[PDB]
Design a protein around this ligand. Sequence first.
Ligand SMILES: Nc1ncnc2c1ncn2[C@@H]1O[C@H](CSCC[C@H](N)C(=O)O)[C@@H](O)[C@H]1O
Lengths: 265, 264
Amino acid sequence: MVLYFIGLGLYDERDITVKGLEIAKKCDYVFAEFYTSLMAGTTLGRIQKLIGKEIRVLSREDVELNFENIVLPLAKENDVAFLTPGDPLVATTHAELRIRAKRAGVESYVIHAPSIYSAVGITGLHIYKFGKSATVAYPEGNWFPTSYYDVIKENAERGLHTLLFLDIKAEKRMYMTANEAMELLLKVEDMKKGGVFTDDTLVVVLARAGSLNPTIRAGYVKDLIREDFGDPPHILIVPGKLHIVEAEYLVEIAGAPMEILRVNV
Amino acid sequence: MVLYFIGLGLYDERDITVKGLEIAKKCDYVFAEFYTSLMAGTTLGRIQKLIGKEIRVLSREDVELNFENIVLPLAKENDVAFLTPGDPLVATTHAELRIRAKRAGVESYVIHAPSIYSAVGITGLHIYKFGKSATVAYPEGNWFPTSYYDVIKENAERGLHTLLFLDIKAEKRMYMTANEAMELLLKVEDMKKGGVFTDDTLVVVLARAGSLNPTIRAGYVKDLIREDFGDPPHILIVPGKLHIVEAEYLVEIAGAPMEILRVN
Ligand SMILES: Nc1ncnc2c1ncn2[C@@H]1O[C@H](CSCC[C@H](N)C(=O)O)[C@@H](O)[C@H]1O
């Protein structure tokens, strides 16, 4: 008679919480989705072996169109789990799935797990300084979206950091790169010319957060745009003016140039 | 011969990730602090029991003044772990401790945990629409902090939600309730009169995130400022402009007034 939204965490099969696991193991049915994001540090197979349960994967339309016909029904006579990467309800559409459950007269509980939203704290940037967040999307056809560029301007203007999620084709397993993203932002700057993103903009790239060996690199576009950050997914962040302690952290941990100590503080 | 920053999670000792549990288990020395936040659903004894280790609990002074004297030293000949509530680097100054470790030639690793910063997702408010965050601090003597007021103001002009961490005086065992925060804000409103936080302001309260039954309530200040949201810890959120589905969640799940649907 219960539905459990359980987060899988950041990178691999051990990023689930001890709570999430013990609850997942005692569920009659376990569903999962990997369209919002991919657990790039593990496999479906490794997740099932840790949870010790057959895991039925769900497509975007499985969830968004038929959540109440695929998942909810089983919750009336059973305890059901719904696993998602990161922290549940972070993806903007997932919270209404709870409204669906209430509507179908189903009890729903949320078991949290690490999200990149809090994990970027490893970049050294202060969490209270992050402003609005956005996603960089590919242009295509006659559509050239650039709102994420305005988010950067409005945040940085107010001395706040911008967390930038990169385009993902979960299903086709193709990630946007930090590099790709920097090129796109450069192209946008040339269209709008607002001084928001240029070769001298300082940025932070975070890759494989959650892993014991993530990649935290900080520097100016001109030096980073062709750097090898590794395998995806990448997270791009455009900091606002830094607190000296943030810059020292980017220098000593993320390998940023001494120059940001006098340029970006 | 390494140091690990391992988050313990939101509510009880089970909010630790499987990765953090199996690593803290094999560490020679385990340190911890419980002054940056409150894990309402557990005790030191159960953490210890679950980790299978003795946890030396540090104070803010131990940490801020003697981290390099208490903890890094043991890191050259042993594997040391430093536990904290929620996520170790979020809304703490712990990231600076990594610098100390490096400057002492001690490599450090971070094991994340569920943080209250992303748990806000359970309020139904889109996490990307949150703007600059702030902390509501207790007035000390003649000193009355008010900067958090301007933060709410900036975000709301932008239409973004504001996350308000609430103060904590761990040594006195005092945890600011959302009620207390709402009262502090009202008097700042009388002070500044910037029409930012009034009796008619819609707010959201999230209490004890991480537990199976957190308290999630939304509604106008006048109705909530005296309401009992249960034990600490609490956070207070002053949303910006709502999306209809945000508002639908707040009404269906957090018990807000239907009128808030009319999202202008
Ligand atoms: N489980 C929880 N429920 C509600 N608020 C919480 C909470 N845990 C922390 N907070 C809020 O955040 C403040 C501590 S701020 C430090 C946050 C911590 N590193 C994390 O990752 O969560 C508290 O005073 C309180 O206002």
